[PDB]
Amino acid sequence: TSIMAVTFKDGVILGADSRTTTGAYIANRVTDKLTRVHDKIWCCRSGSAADTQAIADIVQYHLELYTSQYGTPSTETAASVFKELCYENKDNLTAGIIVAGYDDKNKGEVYTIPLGGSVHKLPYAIAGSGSTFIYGYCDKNFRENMSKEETVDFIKHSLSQAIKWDGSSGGVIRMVVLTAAGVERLIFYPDEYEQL
Amino acid sequence: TQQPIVTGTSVISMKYDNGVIIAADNLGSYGSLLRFNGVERLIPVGDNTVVGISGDISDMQHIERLLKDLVTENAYDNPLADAEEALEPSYIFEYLATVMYQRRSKMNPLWNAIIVAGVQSNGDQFLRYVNLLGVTYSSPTLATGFGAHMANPLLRKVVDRESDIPKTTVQVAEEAIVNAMRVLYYRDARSSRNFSLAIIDKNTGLTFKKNLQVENMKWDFAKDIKGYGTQKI
Amino acid sequence: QFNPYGDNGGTILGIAGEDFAVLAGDTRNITDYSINSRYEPKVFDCGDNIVMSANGFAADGDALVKRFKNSVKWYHFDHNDKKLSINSAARNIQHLLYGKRFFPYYVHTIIAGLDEDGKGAVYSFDPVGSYEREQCRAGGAAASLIMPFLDNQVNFKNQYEPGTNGKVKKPLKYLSVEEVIKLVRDSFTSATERHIQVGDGLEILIVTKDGVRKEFYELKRD
Amino acid sequence: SDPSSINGGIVVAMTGKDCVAIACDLRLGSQSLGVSNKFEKIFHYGHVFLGITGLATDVTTLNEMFRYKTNLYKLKEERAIEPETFTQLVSSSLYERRFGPYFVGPVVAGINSKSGKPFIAGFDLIGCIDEAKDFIVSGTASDQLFGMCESLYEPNLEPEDLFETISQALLNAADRDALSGWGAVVYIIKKDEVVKRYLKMRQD
Amino acid sequence: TTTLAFRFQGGIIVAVDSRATAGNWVASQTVKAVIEINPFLLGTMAGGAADCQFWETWLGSQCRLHELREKERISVAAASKILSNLVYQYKGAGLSMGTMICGYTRKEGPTIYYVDSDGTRLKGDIFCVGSGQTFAYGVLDSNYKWDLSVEDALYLGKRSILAAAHRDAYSGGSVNLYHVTEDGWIYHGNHDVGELFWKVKEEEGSFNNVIG
Amino acid sequence: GYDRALSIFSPDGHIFQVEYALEAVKRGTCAVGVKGKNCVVLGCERRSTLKLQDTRITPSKVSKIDSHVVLSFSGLNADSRILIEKARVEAQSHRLTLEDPVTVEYLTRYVAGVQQRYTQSGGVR
Amino acid sequence: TTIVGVKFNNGVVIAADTRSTQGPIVADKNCAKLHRISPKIWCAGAGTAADTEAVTQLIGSNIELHSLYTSREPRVVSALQMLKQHLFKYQGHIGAYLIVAGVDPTGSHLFSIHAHGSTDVGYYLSLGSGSLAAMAVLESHWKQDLTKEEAIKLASDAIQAGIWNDLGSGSNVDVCVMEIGKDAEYLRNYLTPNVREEKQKSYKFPRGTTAVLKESIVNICD
Amino acid sequence: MDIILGIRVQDSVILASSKAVTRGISVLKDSDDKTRQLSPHTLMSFAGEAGDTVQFAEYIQANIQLYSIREDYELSPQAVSSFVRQELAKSIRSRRPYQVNVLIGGYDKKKNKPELYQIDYLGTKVELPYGAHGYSGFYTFSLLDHHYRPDMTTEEGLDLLKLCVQELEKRMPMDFKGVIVKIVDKDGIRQVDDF
Amino acid sequence: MDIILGIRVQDSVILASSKAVTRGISVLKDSDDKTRQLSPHTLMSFAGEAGDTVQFAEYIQANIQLYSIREDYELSPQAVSSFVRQELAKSIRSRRPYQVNVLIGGYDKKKNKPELYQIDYLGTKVELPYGAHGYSGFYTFSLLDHHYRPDMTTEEGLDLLKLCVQELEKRMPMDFKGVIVKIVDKDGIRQVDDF
Ligand SMILES: *[C@@](C)(CO)[C@](*)(O)[C@H](CC(C)C)NC(=O)[C@H](Cc1ccccc1)NC(=O)[C@H](CC(C)C)NC(=O)[C@H](CCc1ccccc1)NC(=O)CN1CCOCC1
Ligand SMILES: *[C@@](C)(CO)[C@](*)(O)[C@H](CC(C)C)NC(=O)[C@H](Cc1ccccc1)NC(=O)[C@H](CC(C)C)NC(=O)[C@H](CCc1ccccc1)NC(=O)CN1CCOCC1
Ligand SMILES: *[C@@](C)(CO)[C@](*)(O)[C@H](CC(C)C)NC(=O)[C@H](Cc1ccccc1)NC(=O)[C@H](CC(C)C)NC(=O)[C@H](CCc1ccccc1)NC(=O)CN1CCOCC1
Ligand SMILES: [Cl-]
Ligand SMILES: [Mg+2]
Ligand SMILES: [Mg+2]
After folding, report:
1. Sign (positive/negative) of CA torsion A82, A83, A84, A85?
2. Phi and psi torsions of H65, nearest 5°
3. Helix (H), strand (E) at residue E7
4. Within 10 Å of residue G174's Cβ, how many Cβ atoms?
5. What is the DSSP letter of E192?
6. Domain B1-233, CATH
7. How far is Cα I156 from Cα A179, in angstroms, rounded to an integer?
8. Which of B12, C104, G190, I66 could form a disulfide with B151 if both were Cys (CB 3.0 to 4.6 A apart)?
């Protein structure tokens, strides 16, 4: 996997590749690693496909039950539920999750949750095997309060390089845009991003 | 006792009515890292043979040097080096097959899988495989690594047995090879889009094609796929 | 760690008649769950009316056959073109195999031909050189399936004369080349049904005083 | 220390014209040592026959267990259990011990009393059903039995002919296995008569 | 395997079975476990088939070279020691052999030497080697006397192999008998255990545990 | 290693080095062997130009090769010690492998074989 | 095993081969790998044979009870969710690899489930040892907007690729078509391209061949 | 624990069990009785892991004695053997199994027949004319195959048994310090003091 | 191979060595002589790994006999023991060491004294009044500490030796089939036939 989430002026954008592997065989070349846990709280999944799915399903259940009682949860609250599961079951899980959401008060927020189950709130986050190859690029090119189009280009160029160097990453580049306007899904095919 | 470091993935090939086709991508992987992108894994020997190599690249470069030296050695005191006493595909293969088996028998193998494709002096098609263990076999279609699992099934739909070879044209055969390379790009995590392809014909001779790309890919249906089960958005 | 051995599958079968002998083997070559070739012969005419097959790890099998063929060649040079008898060939092969006792050829070897009285002969070897002459022998992946069938149909084991209260055994007798090929074909079609490494094709080499003849038959390709 | 090949033994079952046959060897050993030549591996509950190969303690245990269950079945249902139903009971019971299984290779054989149809089935140690028209094999000489049965068998054999085919399949397979043999028994099963024959075989 | 050889009034009896196995798979029922080193020396074979076959054939070549050089037959002691000294050089390499070198000479009389792959060399009157050795020992020990007739001795050796063939799963097939005298060895036939068992059961009244 | 062929044929078909070795034997003190009906006796000459000798410690002319075989000689004394040593070693080696002491013929054949080897080996006389 | 699933215009089709293995041995030459969870929800299973049957029957049982409780036709996502949560709980120890497909009031669906509890969505999927051979065909010939007859052809062609090229797969091709508004049609042995050829000889024995020691009538009655 | 034998003859069952108890390089005792009376006409010998053997034997003994008191009736050897087998069959899949092999020699008073059952630690039961556990069988079975007849007397059985012990004393590596022999018949259980 | 003992008394050295040769669960021989005469007044007993024992003993025997012929003179027990120790000392650092333990009993004709040397497979030499190899020592040493006196006769030594064998036969787990006893004194080497 190569995944990332980036905050910007109007909110936050999640990005991911579409490759699922079993050794060197690509079990799924059109995977959707960007998953909804609430209307405007989504997550990027890396690590075990089984573990991350089971976790995301439980979180979605918790946040649905939260909403029934206490109304819309914060992105911090969602990240806390993810953490609780990842930390307390750290011995049996292989999950690297990035939580991203849009509040009206707090705007765009990004929380990353590595293997140990620690939580880290950041302006932007990168994760997955392919992230290693773009630490240098992303650090040099990221700016706060970018526009939607700039953020889309930043994610596109970044994941393009991650995909280029990482054999465990590839396929299409999926993106999910979270703003006050709503939820927008984006897709970008090889013929476009490869020749960037 | 070795472990391969910089590696090359599948090599695929097949026979057709007048000759043989062989192909392999231009990638030199370093584990999961797709490190080197300008690697040529098809190596011509003379104007009638092409050796396709997968596996360890350092050992591939060693084999290149052996084949290059073989051509030099054959020319020594040989007035018919470019005629009757030129190197045949069968000669080149048997040499490599001898080396591979000797190296495995010394517990120090050349960590490769090799396919020697060519046309003999009498016009007969030559296509034979050899690997790090010294194991050899021949078939109308041959492939290494993932190609064995994914390409062979596709190529065998064209040439399922010996009698299908005269019925298969170079246009049909090349089409199948190029299609197979696309499928490997879809499904092999250590493959690249860029590849080389070689045709050895008994009439038109050796045609070596570089810098080919996988094209006419299907990705559009991906936009319709959402979530992993229930998710609607 | 590097493993110098491999399993190329396949199975072979040698039957001896009165004035002939057959050595059959399927033409399928495999690694793990993949097919490498649907027609890769592993039964060879080695000269002097000797046919040979070394089944198991193909690289070791090819090396052995190659060395024995070369042994036959030098036997002619060193001994005034004398014909290498099947028994002399067997003993020579023992020394080839045992010469690598501490790094063996992973093959079951079988040879067939005629003895010095003109009668059919089959010899079978273990990987390190122990050999024995037999009327009947199956080797390879499906040997466990085929061999007890041969015991029953070739050597008439467990078969008693009807009405004799299981006191009189069914009498041993030589089979015709026609009856033997029937058993070979039925042996391999049965093995093909129940063993995944067996199929594609069947190549039989028949040996008489006249020479070495070949016969080929299709097998199921699944 | 492989539970399925400590005691040794084999079972085979075949179908014929309006009949079924099931057969087994009589050996029970402890690896190389032969201990008993009277250890029958075929049992019956009403008209349903069950053969069991593998670890002998589990063979005995399962016989006692299916006798237990079929006796209660009959008391509640007021009728004898049929082969198709029994087959499912065996599968259920084995899978109940999925992560601590009985090391066995059972084989069901019988004729449905209502439809008159011949029925045989085989299982793995965790209960996977292997239904078949022709034959089922089980034991330490299963490879040998597969080879004999696949070549000797033909459909619609009469009881008297079927007896010869199954007996020869068992005998010649048992003689190529060290851990099987030491006697044999064959059950020929017709709609309303059952014949049991002990075979003469080599005792080595 | 089961092989035995014992010394008695009338020379030496050698008896072996004919089974060979690869795990539980019975590879052969017709193996020659007695190897004829020469017209006067016999060697039994147990353990590795190839190791025994190869080196005891080699032994016969060395014994032939001895009598060419010395113009005299090789002693059983000298023949057994050539084999034992050879396998001792290969100790640790993984040879598997349990053999009995049996012979009759003037100076020695009837002599048996147990020779094994870990270097052991023992002279003795009675030896049983193989996976079924214990079963054969039981019958042999309880019925053995020095003053056995040649007829009774041949039967005892045959009966002891049968005992092992019956109980030991990895023993059976047939029984090969040999009688060794000063003038050489005499082969006393191949005896299928299938027919031999029932014959012995009926005539002797033994094996009541078996249904006949 | 010194390789020179010292023992070689001459035009008349003689190997002079072997024949000159016989002259050295002819120079040596006389030695005689006589065998009776139940015994053998080995007699040996000792030259009397050497007085003030210590006969306790002086090497004896007759040497035991084993407890049942003896060896006397004529010729170069230093050379004899080498043959005697080799013979004694072979005597023990024979007992070890054949489990029986050497015959007199066998021991002789061995010693004679050693002597012959030195007539067509390079670098030796 | 080779199993596949292909979506089309008005529904979904799944297919499977019919070989069951026990190591290198073919245990069942015609086993059914297509399972019914509910009338219009079917499942193709690969991996541990007992696990795929047991888990498909358990979820099928609970789906029936759920359908009765809710007075509604069962949905594929319910079977999917129930299966994956069961498989996840056992951490891969239940070796069931499934392709789940069907039609329900929501529409037509196609999923795959792996032993550890991960699910995938697709228009075409393949699982089992012959999945690579099958996927090669699917990647070569699949397109959007397939008809019923085109999807059956593509599915069976993908299974055939596994039958011929994968040693783990063989024998026949089973198919199940689940179309919207129609009853699901289970096509057992849709293709039978591996029929055993006539044997060369009949091995029917003369009566009395087998030696017998004892006979006795067995009492099956009360 | 090592050698236990059993021979069923015409009118009785004879059990022979070694007297040695060895731990390390020391024979701690040479007069150990490796048997327990389960009921007046049923005797069980045992061999296996230290501690487990006696603990198991006495546990079975207690259960059979409890049954006898409750019903005022003696269980048949067949019934006792089945009870014992089931206990071992349970045991083998426990957290820590009983590593004990047993022979059960009994006289059925209803049938007027002697009965010998051999049960190993896995719960593998067989009725036999003669039986053994451990390495003993590798010598005795072939010997008994030859010399055993079904119609033998108790005295003939004891001579047959002496023949087994002699063979074991000749060919066994370990010194097992002889055997305690006990006879089970219609009149109950008694010990042979001079063997 | 297992039990070898040695006792030096006033005028002689007595060696006792077990007769059993065991392989697996079978006693292959019960009359094995685990000793070789190195010279007329020097005897060596041995025990250890199969094959190595005899091969080593005979190799030493050949070397000492060669020396005797060459010099027409018998080496002293001290000299022979030192030669043997050095061979084992070389061996222990070889590719495949001799796993053989020996006792060397000899009578020195120049000193007119008996001498007993104990040498293990490492090349560890000690001169002792009494010695043993293997598990035998664990019983015999304490017994000899109590009963042994330096001025004992050969007959007293044999009775002392009988006391050791009896204790071994009582407490040792394995049956070693008795011992062959040999005496070394001024008149050379002789075997006690009735022990
Ligand atoms: C990139 C690839 C790596 O960072 C991404 O993180 C993606 C995440 C997406 C899918 C959300 N990761 C994967 O694709 C993931 C890679 C992986 C593998 C093993 C452990 C962790 C991560 N792949 C999987 O989870 C596959 C998905 C299946 C094919 C649908 N599952 C496997 O590879 C299973 C995993 C078993 C497992 C191991 C350890 C922890 C949890 C689960 N492994 C196998 O099936 C083993 N396989 C058997 C056949 O022989 C080859 C090995
Ligand atoms: C009784 C019968 C059992 O011990 C006897 O001891 C007999 C004596 C007769 C055979 C002379 N012994 C055997 O039968 C002996 C058992 C044995 C095997 C291996 C080591 C020690 C003892 N059997 C063999 O040696 C068989 C003889 C064959 C069946 C003719 N051979 C094998 O098992 C061979 C080679 C084994 C081996 C020995 C040493 C180094 C390497 C290998 N193995 C195979 O044939 C396996 N298979 C052959 C087909 O190709 C794939 C490998
Ligand atoms: C293709 C053919 C292979 O990939 C398919 O995937 C099919 C699936 C269909 C049948 C639903 N798979 C098999 O046929 C499968 C392959 C396999 C084997 C072993 C482990 C995993 C997968 N075969 C089986 O499941 C057979 C079914 C038999 C023929 C009825 N079962 C076995 O081979 C069992 C394995 C049981 C098992 C237990 C615990 C964990 C995993 C598997 N093995 C045995 O029965 C062998 N043995 C017999 C002697 O007694 C001891 C057990
Ligand atoms: Cl996923
Ligand atoms: Mg196939
Ligand atoms: Mg047997």
Report:
1. positive
2. -60, -40
3. strand E3-8
4. 25
5. E
6. 3.60.20.10
7. 110
8. B12
**Structural method:** X-ray
| Full domain range(s) for residue E198 | 1-212
Residues from chain E that touch I25, judged by Cβ atoms under 8 A, are 134
**Residue G42 three-state SS:** strand
In angstroms, rounded to a whole number, what is the distance separating the alpha carbons of residues B94 and E100?
48
A71 CB under 6 A from ligand 1?
A: no
Residue type, B212: L
Structure tokens at B191: 């493959």
Q: Domain tally for chain G?
A: 1
Task: Measure CA of the first residue to CA of the last residue in chain E; give whole Å.
Answer: 26
I155 token code pair = 């007959």
Q: Which residues line ligand 3 (CB under 6 A)?
A: D 4, 54, 105, 124-126, 128, 130; G 1, 19-22, 27, 31, 33, 45-49, 52, 95, 128-129, 168-169
Specify whether the CB–CB gap between E31 and E190 falls below 8 A.
no
Q: Domain holding I189: CATH number?
A: 3.60.20.10
Mutation test residue for ligand 2: of C8, C64, C123, C126, the one with most atoms within 8 Å of CB: C126
Question: Residue D151 corresponds to which tokens in the numbers above?
Answer: 């070549």
Domain range list for chain C: 1-222
Q: How many C-beta atoms surround the C-beta of residue B142 within 10 A? A: 29
Q: Which amino acid is at D152?
A: L
Separation CA E90–CA E99 (nearest Å): 16
Question: Is I70 near chain H, with CB under 8 Å?
Answer: no
**Does E5 show up as a binding residue in the annotation?**
no
- Distance from C-alpha of E161 to C-alpha of E165, rounded to nearest angstrom: 6
User: Which string of b and e fits G64-86 if b means at least 16 CB within 10 Å?
Assistant: eebbeeeeeebbbbbbbbbbbeb
What pairs with residue B49 in β-bridges? Answer: B118
Residue C99 tokens read as 């010469």
How many CB atoms sit inside 10 A of residue B18's CB?
A: 20
Q: Which residues pair with D135 in a beta bridge?
A: D14
Pick the closest to residue C159 from E116, D181, G208 (CA basis).
G208
Structural resolution in Å = 2.7
Place of tokens 């064998």: I165
Query: Which positions in chain I have a beta carbon within 8 angstroms of at least one beta carbon in chain E?
Result: 21, 23, 25-26, 28-29, 32, 49-52, 54-55, 96
Q: Are G67 and G38 in contact (CB under 8 A)?
A: yes
Residue A121 identity (one-letter amino acid): K
3-state secondary structure of E9: coil
Minimal CA separation from G156 to chain E, in Å: 40
| Structure tokens that stand for C123 in this block | 């010899």
Provide the residue type at D164 as one letter: E
G31 inside 8 A of chain D by CB: yes
Nearest CA to ligand 3 atom 40: G48
**Tokens 């009993």 correspond to what residue?**
I105
Answer yes or no: B169 catalytic.
no
Nearest ligand for residue A46 CA: 1
Residues of A in contact with B190 (CB under 8 A): 24, 167
| Topology of domain D1-204, CATH | Glutamine Phosphoribosylpyrophosphate, subunit 1, domain 1 (3.60.20)
What residue ranges do the domains of chain D occupy?
1-204
What CATH class has C1-222?
alpha beta
Distance from the CA of E47 to the center of ligand 2, in angstroms?
8
Asked whether G36 lines ligand 1 (CB < 6 A), one says no
Q: Which of residues 133 through 162 in chain G touch A, CB cutoff 8 A?
A: none
Tokens of A55: 């976790």
Are E120 and I50 in contact by the 8 Å Cβ rule? The answer is: yes
Provide the residue type at G139 as one letter.
E
How many residues are given for chain H? Answer: 195
